[PDB]
Amino acid sequence: XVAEIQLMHQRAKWLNSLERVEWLRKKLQDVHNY
Amino acid sequence: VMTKEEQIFLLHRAQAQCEKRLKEVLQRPAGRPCLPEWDHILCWPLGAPGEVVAVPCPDYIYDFNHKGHAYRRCDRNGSWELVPGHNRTWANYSECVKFLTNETREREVFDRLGMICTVGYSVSLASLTVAVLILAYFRRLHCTRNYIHMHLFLSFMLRAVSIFVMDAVLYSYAGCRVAVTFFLYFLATNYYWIAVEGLYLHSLIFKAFFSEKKYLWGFTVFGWGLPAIFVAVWVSVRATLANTGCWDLSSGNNKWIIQVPILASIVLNFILFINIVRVLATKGIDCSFWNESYLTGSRDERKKSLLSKFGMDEGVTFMFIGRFDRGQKGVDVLLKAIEILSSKKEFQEMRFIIIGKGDPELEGWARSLEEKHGNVKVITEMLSREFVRELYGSVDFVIIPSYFEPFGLVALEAMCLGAIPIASAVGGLRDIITNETGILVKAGDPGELANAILKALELSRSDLSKFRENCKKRAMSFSDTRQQYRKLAKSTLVLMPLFGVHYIVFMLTPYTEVSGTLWQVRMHYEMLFNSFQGFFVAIAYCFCNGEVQAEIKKSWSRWTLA
């Protein structure tokens, strides 16, 4: 559509990716503690 | 596509599989191996004493390098190798986390483009709010033309409110769908109200007479109704098939049932644009100059003095002024018509003044008639427009035998000065001249022009003052109407192709570059253009409008009185 639509879509995927990586780094700390 | 919740579910399943595997091993113990155990991410197998154990990076972890392996070591006794200094099991995860040091580089692009969005839409909303308030405050600015502008202003204002709602719920599911639906509706009303601006301007020019109230009612249904139609069809086709993402409109063919109606308005605007520019001249006549009130004495006195300067007696005077060419301005048609009339007895009552330059053979032909007949004057030198105005206000008829004439500004100049036009029924002369304000003839026909000149001579035997007055009112009311339309077209003819060409170019440019040099320059420019669209419309229809500026200067002068 228009450029403002694709920005919201890339932002949505970027925030979900950020949330997922933060969860993975938290598990990696649990592995480190184990 | 992969959510944090989805990874949690996949990790829970992997943990349950590890618990079952360990129970199957404990029921049949043998030897001294390292036992399986769950370390919160993956399940380790049986370990042989003194051997390194490698496990491929788990599939259920989306962000891992799935071509690498995690590592452990098993003691000679049969215990997993520990971390030195602590009672923790040691492991090597460097390969799985290899390409997982991304940190943030995309933040720079998303923050810049998002700032351009908020800045551009804020300036657009602020400029549109003061624009709609000015048009509603001053009572002198209340007309159908400004009512259409206020509808166009409101559509861009609601579009700005929609994106502020979209990024608000983004900063924090069905609430997102209604947000993008309202945005696509307002986006469609913007392009359809631009088509309304083109239809209104095209109607003022090509419709001699219509009802503005009824047209405004049809424009409201066109601008707000039709976008709601194919957007509702869009929501109907969308929600039924599945329940995909909120902002991935471009992925499926569902986007074409909304882009096509928007494209249809752009094609309609290109049609209206071509019709208007072929008929509406870029600049009118100098109204401050072409006025008979600049002349002194009566028209009879001015014509007698004029013909005396050329060395002729009084008579019905016909004038031609224009380029001497073969198939355009039509001086060849006039010269042939003068030869046809030269054998008539009525020729002695006529006077001819031919002014122009161009083809040498037509210049010699004109000079030949001037030398052959004592009632024909030819001027090939350059004349000031003061002397041309003297001729328009002294002669009886002006002959305009053009083969084509899109605007006919020469007719309007002569008619404003009382000269009755005899012109070809082509182009603008056809729309300007009627039976009560001139004589029209078929183009390229010397006989029809000769007969029209004969009818003009018989007409001159009676008083022509009333005929001259009708020609003045016609030229004055035609140029007044044209100058009013030109002010509206000064901005409408700019916004129609600007929005249309940008939309088509941006639609034909794909998202293939994926944050490359091409991608960042397209995303930066399209965000700048789309965000300041309301600011562009506010300037074109209010801040640059001559009536609006004159009203704020009137208010500022009353507030600044020494």
Ligand SMILES: *[C@@H]1O[C@H](CO[C@H]2O[C@@H](C)[C@@H](O)[C@@H](O)[C@@H]2O)[C@@H](O[C@@H]2O[C@H](CO)[C@@H](O[C@@H]3O[C@H](CO[C@H]4O[C@H](CO)[C@@H](O)[C@H](O)[C@@H]4O)[C@@H](O)[C@H](O[C@H]4O[C@H](CO)[C@@H](O)[C@H](O)[C@@H]4O)[C@@H]3O)[C@H](O)[C@H]2NC(C)=O)[C@H](O)[C@H]1NC(C)=O
């Ligand atoms: C270091 O820390 C360990 C704790 O576990 C960790 O390991 C480190 C490396 C990291 O990975 C940490 O994240 C992780 O948490 C300590 O391990 C623990 O060690 C003790 C002592 O060896 C274990 O206790 C024993 O468990 C045996 C297995 O139990 C089961 O099987 C028996 C079979 O008879 C059943 O009865 C039970 O119901 C269970 O199903 C068990 O055989 C041992 O038996 C004895 O004691 C009981 C009474 O308590 C008695 O009745 C019996 O006759 C035996 O005499 C004992 O119970 C413990 O399970 C183990 N825990 C884990 C999670 O591994 C490690 O010792 C420590 N090392 C040092 C030196 O600091």
Ligand SMILES: *[C@@H]1O[C@H](CO)[C@@H](O[C@@H]2O[C@H](CO)[C@@H](O[C@@H]3O[C@H](CO[C@H]4O[C@H](CO)[C@@H](O)[C@H](O)[C@@H]4O)[C@@H](O)[C@H](O)[C@@H]3O)[C@H](O)[C@H]2NC(C)=O)[C@H](O)[C@H]1NC(C)=O
């Ligand atoms: C594989 O198996 C081998 C044979 O069992 C292991 O060797 C044995 O290791 C144990 C201890 O893990 C030794 O046990 C006794 O150890 C204590 C240690 O003292 C403690 O106090 C300090 C703090 O002051 C603390 O840090 C320690 O954790 C202990 O709590 C000594 O005080 C005793 O004298 C006694 O030695 C055995 O001596 C040792 N030898 C045997 C039994 O052959 C070996 O570590 C295992 N690992 C590998 C990879 O080989």
Ligand SMILES: *[C@@H]1O[C@H](CO[C@H]2O[C@@H](C)[C@@H](O)[C@@H](O)[C@@H]2O)[C@@H](O[C@@H]2O[C@H](CO)[C@@H](O[C@@H]3O[C@H](CO)[C@@H](O)[C@H](O)[C@@H]3O)[C@H](O)[C@H]2NC(C)=O)[C@H](O)[C@H]1NC(C)=O
């Ligand atoms: C934690 O593990 C990683 C990954 O390890 C290797 O482990 C060995 C046992 C074996 O399975 C091997 O196939 C694995 O790759 C260690 O990182 C890497 O270290 C190896 C050397 O052992 C590097 O190999 C290379 O070899 C070529 C040819 O000789 C050289 O040209 C290269 O320079 C390099 O030496 C490999 O590239 C390393 N991998 C990465 C991702 O860096 C890591 O050292 C280890 N750490 C600890 C503390 O154990």
Ligand SMILES: CCCCCCCC/C=C\CCCCCCCC(=O)O
């Ligand atoms: C987006 C703006 C659309 C037009 C705004 C007006 C909405 C309806 C309110 C009043 C309409 C009736 C009066 C029409 C003349 C306005 C001048 C006046 O009466 O003060």
Ligand SMILES: CCCCCCCC/C=C\CCCCCCCC(=O)O
């Ligand atoms: C990325 C897109 C780059 C191309 C943008 C092209 C913009 C074209 C828009 C307007 C150009 C034509 C304007 C014509 C105005 C005519 C005014 C008049 O005739 O009175």
Ligand SMILES: CCCCCCCC/C=C\CCCCCCCC(=O)O
């Ligand atoms: C990419 C940049 C696009 C700029 C779009 C500008 C829109 C406005 C353009 C024309 C509207 C009329 C402008 C009149 C300028 C003179 C103002 C005046 O003196 O009255």
Ligand SMILES: CCCCCCCC/C=C\CCCCCCCC(=O)O
């Ligand atoms: C305090 C604001 C002025 C109102 C008080 C009355 C005095 C008005 C006389 C002069 C003040 C305005 C001066 C404006 C200069 C305009 C120059 C320009 O328009 O180019």
Ligand SMILES: [Cl-]
């Ligand atoms: Cl006509």
